[PDB]
């Protein structure tokens, strides 16, 4: 819910630096993806509504115990709000931040062999929306510059024209690019339209709506930080300053 509320490249990247990798993984076994299922949607129909389980739903699913599965779980957390079930990774990797896993060689993970075609295919990209695609392209760009595969990233974008049109423009090593970027990456927020407490047919839409109504409850709760009222109560380390920049950028 917190990750899905980030609306800018600065806020999203700042959140990924603070959060550790254990948030990306989940310890609930869940079910398996790519399975045709019959779910119950009684507000609309009496029969059982068919659908297909995927990795993009907000429910935890069993994942493969490899580097490919780890990256899919990280991107799933960013674009959906929940990750997968990959246990016994190791406390050394789980303490490090999501950004460090994505763009630092010191962690020890090897991601050079990863192919963006199957990752996009597995993390079903024909079913994503514009905001979800932009976040995935951010993760691909961060990984590509980590292993020096910028040329491969460009060729992949040139093959898929719609991805190129919405691809965010920022250099992973430069902080000026993050500041200048004005893409909207928010999947949840205060809605201008009328948001009701009703169900949606698809698994993806129902889970997304639950996060949206959950954010409204959290926005009006006591855990939210109203800057206009209590800006002098935050500590100096976490106060918003223009001089602030990501570590190593």
């Amino acid at each position: 819910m917190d990750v899905l509320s980030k609306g800018s490249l600065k806020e999203l990247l700042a959140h990924l630096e603070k959060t550790p990798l254990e948030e990306a993984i989940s310890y609930r076994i869940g079910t398996v993806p790519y399975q045709n299922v019959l779910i119950s949607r009684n507000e609309y129909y009496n029969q059982l509504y068919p659908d297909t389980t995927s990795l993009i739903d907000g429910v935890s699913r069993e994942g493969q115990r490899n580097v490919n599965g780890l990256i899919m779980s990280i991107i799933s957390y960013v674009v959906s709000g929940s990750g997968h079930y990959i246990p016994n990774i190791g406390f050394m990797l789980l303490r490090r931040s999501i950004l460090d896993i994505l763009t630092k060689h010191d962690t020890g993970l090897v991601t050079n062999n990863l192919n963006y075609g199957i990752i996009a295919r597995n993390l079903t990209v024909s079913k994503m929306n514009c905001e979800q695609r932009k976040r995935m392209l951010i993760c691909f760009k961060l990984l590509a510059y980590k292993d020096g595969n910028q040329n491969d990233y460009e060729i992949y974008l040139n093959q898929n024209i719609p991805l190129k049109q919405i691809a965010p423009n920022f250099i992973p090593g430069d902080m000026r690019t993050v500041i200048h970027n004005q893409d909207q990456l928010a999947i949840v927020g205060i809605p201008a339209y009328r948001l009701t407490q009703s169900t949606e047919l698809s698994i993806r839409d129902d889970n997304a709506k639950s996060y949206k109504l959950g954010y409204v409850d959290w926005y009006n709760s006591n855990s939210f930080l109203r800057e206009r009222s209590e800006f002098n109560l935050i500590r100096l380390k976490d106060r918003d300053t223009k001089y602030g920049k990501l570590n190593g950028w």
Binding site: R228, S229, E230, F231, N232, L233, L236, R239, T241
Partner: protein
């Protein structure tokens, strides 16, 4: 406060002949006298401020011209007709009369509508309103540049809050701005901070003494709530003075304090020396004072003499005292506490202050973990005698009283130090030093201070008094920074380096006095605050400024170029570049009447004194060029003037008035005056008339009555009426939805 300018200065006048044949538009920026033989740029700067005042761009401003419009009666026309600039009706009348002379049909309705709709106001995407009016070129260029410079310091209110969000503490109630201020609020603030280092480094003793005395006057007002020799000397007369010293030692870095002991030390001097080493920061005690304190304890406890230990080192003195049974031979570093907010005038920096009485904030005890064991050692020690333990027991009891007092009162003094520390910036924290030892502690006052330590009471009156001081300090620092910038600019422009020659020294001294006498006349350039800093030593404020300015010559201190400096530099550059706009020129030509020189025939003047450019060749031969100095010194000027020449190397001030009638174009005075000392050119004033081309009387008068003519380059202010589209210029006025906030403070004063 921002100035909201209602109208645009165009400075356009229309001059037309009575016949109506010829009309022209002129920019009237005035006449500015220029003196030859001295620097032109220096004179341009003086005239730049006057020109800025004339145009109304000297002070920060925005343009409100979006309401200066009307609407035509036609139902199709929904355009806005601007009322600024030269009225299109005046141009229509001038064109209307011109056609009457030529027996041409009058301007048509469609042609009238196009002309009368040239001045319009329309909005852009951002919400600003742009006005297209007839105005002069020089006025438009200067006005638009000034707008660009001032708009750099106009920012959104939310942008201002983000800049200062790290300086706001947590004890102040947040201010609720109205919803209109949050969306459409703007503030004019200058966000560049000037260093106080140039003044502090040049005068360390005076700057330190000024701030130290100011702080003590404020601190001294805080509300508070062998044995015989020790017990007979307690006095609380100077406790407020000792209290201020304690806060100063902790709020500053390297504020050295000193104590002087008597010729023959007693139990009180040893008590004071022990209290100094135990309960004062090591950063505030120098090595020499440390040695003096060790010597004083050694003289008394070991019963030696000052002569014996005058040559003893620190390590030797510690060994002697430890052997006797005295363990208090060490000074302790204080524990630095970080401020909760960024200090004032220190962007992106972390402030810190020492915790009083050497109390560790984590353990809430003294930094010495052997303190209780040490006191037992003193109690069972045999000092100054074979037996009796009178000195040890007395010192042990006195030491225990100080230990409990410091432990109970450390929180109260830490709060006092923290609040006063927020008043000074980081540069003053690291730079100010105690020179001349103008604060010292009597040994009796020290041991009375710790034996009778008083709790600190923070009443509402004290909190309110400190908040008033914070506003005063902020204004004082801002005023000092401005005067430092003004002084640095003045020294760079007016002074140079010195040489080991009498001429250079004499030149420097005379120039220094001329500058000083100028900057102290009328309203002084320098504020009363820094004059107080420089006078604190007793010298006259005028003399102190002269001394400080001399030290600053040749500095490499960076000075930020403010918007007002940029504006005047623009006006100065255009003053030199476009001289004809301001009534002076660097070249004139004198020719006999029978020599035919090409002139500017655009305006229809009779025998126009204006040439597009002074000719390079006349009659196939290059025109002679003579400088003014050589011309003034000539004795055969009659022979030279017969052929005609060009005068240059001087700044010629000229004036002219265009007469609507027809007559003989001539000068008010003769061209030159010949004296036994030298030849000069009389003031130039042209009477210019329009020409009828068929008047035999005026043709004969011009050819025969006047024998010599003076030619200058055509002034750029003039512009023929046919080219009225060249005066069409744009001006951008910000949106009327903005609200400007005078007080951008983000918090209120209440606990």
């Amino acid at each position: 406060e921002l100035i909201k300018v209602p109208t645009i200065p165009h400075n356009l006048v229309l001059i037309q002949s009575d016949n109506g044949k010829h009309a022209l538009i002129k920019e009237d920026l005035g006449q500015w006298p220029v003196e030859t033989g001295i620097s032109l740029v220096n004179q341009a700067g003086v005239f730049a401020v006057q020109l800025a005042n004339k145009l109304g761009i000297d002070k920060p401003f925005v343009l409100d011209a979006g309401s200066n419009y009307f609407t035509d009666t036609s139902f199709i026309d929904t355009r806005k007709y601007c009322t600024d600039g030269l009225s299109p009706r005046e141009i229509q009348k001038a064109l209307n009369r011109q056609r009457a002379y030529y027996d041409r049909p009058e301007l048509t309705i469609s042609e009238n509508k196009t002309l009368l709709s040239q001045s319009i106001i329309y909005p852009d995407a951002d919400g600003n309103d742009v006005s297209i009016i007839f105005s002069g070129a020089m006025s438009h260029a200067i006005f638009t540049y000034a707008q660009s410079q001032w708009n750099k310091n106009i920012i959104k209110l939310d942008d201002y809050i983000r800049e200062i969000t790290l300086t706001v503490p947590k004890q102040y109630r947040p201010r609720r701005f109205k919803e209109i201020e949050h969306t459409h609020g703007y503030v004019y603030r200058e966000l560049n901070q000037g260093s106080l280092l140039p003044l502090v480094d040049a005068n360390l003793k005076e700057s330190s003494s000024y701030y130290f005395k100011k702080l003590m006057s404020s601190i001294s007002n805080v509300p508070v709530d062998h044995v015989s020799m020790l017990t007979n000397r307690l006095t609380t007369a100077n406790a407020p003075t000792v209290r201020a010293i304690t806060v100063l030692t902790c709020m500053f870095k390297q504020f050295r304090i000193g104590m002087t002991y008597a010729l023959d030390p007693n139990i009180m001097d040893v008590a004071a020396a022990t209290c100094m080493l135990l309960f004062r920061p090591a950063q505030s005690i120098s090595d020499e004072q440390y040695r003096y304190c060790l010597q004083t304890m050694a003289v008394f406890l070991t019963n030696t003499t000052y002569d014996i230990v005058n040559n003893d080192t620190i390590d030797v003195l510690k060994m002697k005292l430890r052997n006797q049974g005295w363990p208090f031979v060490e000074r302790y570093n204080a524990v630095e506490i970080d401020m909760s907010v960024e200090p004032l005038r220190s962007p992106g920096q972390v402030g810190r202050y020492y915790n009083p009485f050497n109390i560790d904030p984590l353990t809430k005890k003294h930094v010495e973990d052997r303190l209780e064991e040490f006191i037992n050692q003193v109690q069972v020690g045999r000092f100054r005698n074979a037996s009796g333990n009178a000195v040890g027991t007395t010192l042990a009891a006195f030491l225990r009283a100080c230990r409990d007092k410091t432990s109970a009162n450390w929180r109260g003094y830490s709060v006092l130090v923290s609040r006063y520390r927020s008043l000074i910036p980081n540069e003053l924290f690291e730079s100010l030093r105690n020179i001349s030892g103008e604060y010292n502690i009597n040994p009796q006052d020290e041991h009375s201070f710790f034996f009778a330590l008083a709790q600190i009471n923070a009443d509402d009156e004290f909190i309110g008094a400190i908040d008033k001081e914070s506003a005063e300090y902020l204004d004082e620092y801002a005023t000092l920074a401005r005067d430092i910038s003004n002084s640095l600019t003045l020294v760079k422009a007016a002074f140079g380096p010195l040489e080991r020659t009498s001429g250079s020294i004499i030149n420097h001294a005379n120039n220094l006095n001329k500058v000083i006498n100028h900057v102290f006349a009328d309203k002084p350039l320098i504020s009363e605050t820094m004059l107080k800093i420089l006078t604190i030593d007793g010298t006259t404020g005028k003399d102190g400024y002269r001394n400080w300015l001399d030290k600053l010559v040749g500095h490499n201190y960076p000075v930020y170029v403010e918007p007002v400096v940029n504006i005047m530099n623009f006006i100065s550059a255009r003053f030199v570049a476009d001289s004809s706009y301001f009534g002076y020129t660097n070249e004139i030509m004198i020719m006999p009447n029978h020599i035919n020189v090409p002139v500017d025939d655009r305006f229809g003047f009779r025998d126009s004194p204006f040439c597009t450019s002074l000719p390079r060749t006349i009659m196939g031969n290059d025109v002679r060029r003579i400088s003014y100095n050589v011309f003034s010194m000539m004795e055969d000027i009659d022979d030279v003037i017969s052929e005609g020449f060009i005068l240059y190397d001087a700044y010629f001030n000229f004036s002219y008035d265009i007469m609507t009638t027809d007559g003989v174009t001539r000068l008010k005075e003769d061209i030159l005056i010949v004296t036994d000392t030298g030849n000069d050119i009389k003031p130039i004033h042209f009477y210019i008339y329009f020409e009828n081309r068929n008047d035999k009387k005026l043709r004969y008068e011009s050819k025969m009555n006047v024998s010599y003519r003076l030619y200058i380059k055509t002034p750029a202010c003039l512009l023929p009426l046919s080219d009225y589209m060249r005066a069409q210029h744009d001006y951008v006025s910000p949106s009327s939805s903005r609200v400007y906030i005078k007080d951008p403070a983000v918090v209120y004063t209440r606990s």
